[PDB]
């Protein structure tokens, strides 16, 4: 037993840094809001990439590629990865539908990894970074 034990972070890859932008059901998007979202994504994309992550970005505007993306992340093997990161990004001052749809997505995204449902991530860090406002 060892108080300074660290997670083993010496696998071939770091892992996927998934970045999800919650965009659907949000109207009256101001210019500062639009370029801030792009600022947050780009900033997150740079910083995680430099730490060895393979950044994957997508949104919920289409819905076709949403399901195609959600099932892709479900079936991905992380056997050669150190960890997994998922950033959920959304706007403040959202309407009732927007906020509610956020919680469903957050429950779903993390629902895919709860109670060790992804066997290649067992014993490996699963970091979830959530920016939301009701």
């Amino acid at each position: 037993f060892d108080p300074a034990e660290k997670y083993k972070m010496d696998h071939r890859r770091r892992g996927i840094a998934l970045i999800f932008n919650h965009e659907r059901f949000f109207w009256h998007l101001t210019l500062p809001e639009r370029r801030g979202t792009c600022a947050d994504r780009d900033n997150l994309t740079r910083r995680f990439s430099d730490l060895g992550f393979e950044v994957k970005c997508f949104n919920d505007l289409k819905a076709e590629e949403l399901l195609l993306k959600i099932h892709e992340v479900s079936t991905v093997s992380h056997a050669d990865a150190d960890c997994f990161v998922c950033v959920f990004l959304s706007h403040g001052e959202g309407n009732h539908i927007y906020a509610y749809d956020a919680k469903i997505e957050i429950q779903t995204l993390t629902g895919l990894f709860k109670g060790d449902k992804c066997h290649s991530l067992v014993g490996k860090p699963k970091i979830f970074i959530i920016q939301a406002c009701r």
Partner: protein, 93 residues
Amino acid sequence: LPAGADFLMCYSVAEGYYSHRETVNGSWYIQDLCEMLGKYGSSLEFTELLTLVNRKVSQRRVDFCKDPSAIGKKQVPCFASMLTKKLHFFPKS
């Protein structure tokens, strides 16, 4: 918030606190997270780094003279850990 083992849940704001609106530069939480990631990410332990993000963000204020609407309020982030070990992101060999 059903989360299993080896999870680390990082929140931009706790309950009963305010989130500063999106600017051209982005958001407070993500700016500071990213400033810290870029400065300490490859050296410090990650929960230590997120504690710095808790501080930086929670110390952020706004010009109360221009906008005295948002006065006496701050953004206080939070994180929940079910990690069993220290977490470092040292450069991969």
